[PDB]
Design an enzyme around this catalytic site. Structure first.
Site, short mmCIF file in Angstrom:
data_model
loop_
_atom_site.label_atom_id
_atom_site.label_comp_id
_atom_site.label_asym_id
_atom_site.label_seq_id
_atom_site.Cartn_x
_atom_site.Cartn_y
_atom_site.Cartn_z
N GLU A 27 -34.19 2.53 -62.25
CA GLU A 27 -33.38 2.10 -61.12
C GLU A 27 -34.15 1.16 -60.20
OE1 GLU A 27 -30.34 2.29 -60.60
OE2 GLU A 27 -29.56 3.94 -61.81
N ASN B 106 -24.08 -5.02 -55.27
CA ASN B 106 -23.07 -4.74 -56.29
C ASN B 106 -21.93 -5.74 -56.17
OD1 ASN B 106 -24.34 -2.32 -57.30
ND2 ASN B 106 -23.66 -1.32 -55.42
N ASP C 292 -18.85 -5.47 -56.01
CA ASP C 292 -17.81 -5.12 -55.04
C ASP C 292 -18.26 -5.30 -53.59
OD1 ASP C 292 -19.17 -2.58 -56.37
OD2 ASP C 292 -18.80 -2.06 -54.27
N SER D 99 -20.82 -3.64 -52.06
CA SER D 99 -21.72 -2.57 -51.67
C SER D 99 -23.14 -2.89 -52.13
CB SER D 99 -21.26 -1.24 -52.26
OG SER D 99 -21.28 -1.27 -53.68
N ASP E 187 -27.06 -1.04 -53.40
CA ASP E 187 -27.88 0.10 -53.83
C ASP E 187 -29.23 0.04 -53.12
OD1 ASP E 187 -25.80 0.79 -55.58
OD2 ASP E 187 -26.80 -0.06 -57.33
N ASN F 73 -25.93 4.22 -53.41
CA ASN F 73 -24.88 3.22 -53.23
C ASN F 73 -24.19 3.40 -51.87
OD1 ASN F 73 -22.66 1.48 -53.46
ND2 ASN F 73 -22.28 2.00 -55.61
#
Ligand SMILES: [K+]
Length: 128
Positions: A35, A46, A48, A50, A52, A59
């Site tokens: 990650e 992301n 959309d 958002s 991380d 998230n």
């Protein structure tokens, strides 16, 4: 902060992740590697809108507030910036809530695709 493998394993264990909800310590270390590469300051946008955050790439759509994810929730009730500190406490406690939400560690795509079903104990082999 960029953790070492064994440094991170020890801090995760101190904070209660070893066998948390049935997931041995090697799963969490493997997840952190893929990650974030063990980097507490990792951020990744992301599609959309958002973002991380942190060593486990938590998230903002659901779990933390960054003030720029319209229509999102803050279920761990923390600023996403708390997930970037050299102290992993906030990331770990939020990870515990994520993993307890019904899908276990499948919440982490890297875990499902790169750790699940492998010899994750290798990630903690040799550590004190
Ligand atoms: K599970």
């Amino acid at each position: 902060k960029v953790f070492g493998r064994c440094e991170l394993a020890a801090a995760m264990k101190r904070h209660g992740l070893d066998n948390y909800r049935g997931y041995s310590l090697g799963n969490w270390v493997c997840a952190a590697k893929f990650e974030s590469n063990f980097n507490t300051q990792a951020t990744n946008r992301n599609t959309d809108g958002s973002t991380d955050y942190g060593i486990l790439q938590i998230n903002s759509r659901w779990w933390c507030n960054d003030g720029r994810t319209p229509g999102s929730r803050n279920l761990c009730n923390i600023p996403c910036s708390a997930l970037l500190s050299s102290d992993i406490t906030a990331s770990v406690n939020c990870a515990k809530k994520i993993v307890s939400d019904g899908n276990g560690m499948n919440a982490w795509v890297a875990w499902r695709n790169r750790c699940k079903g492998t010899d994750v104990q290798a990630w903690i082999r040799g550590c004190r």
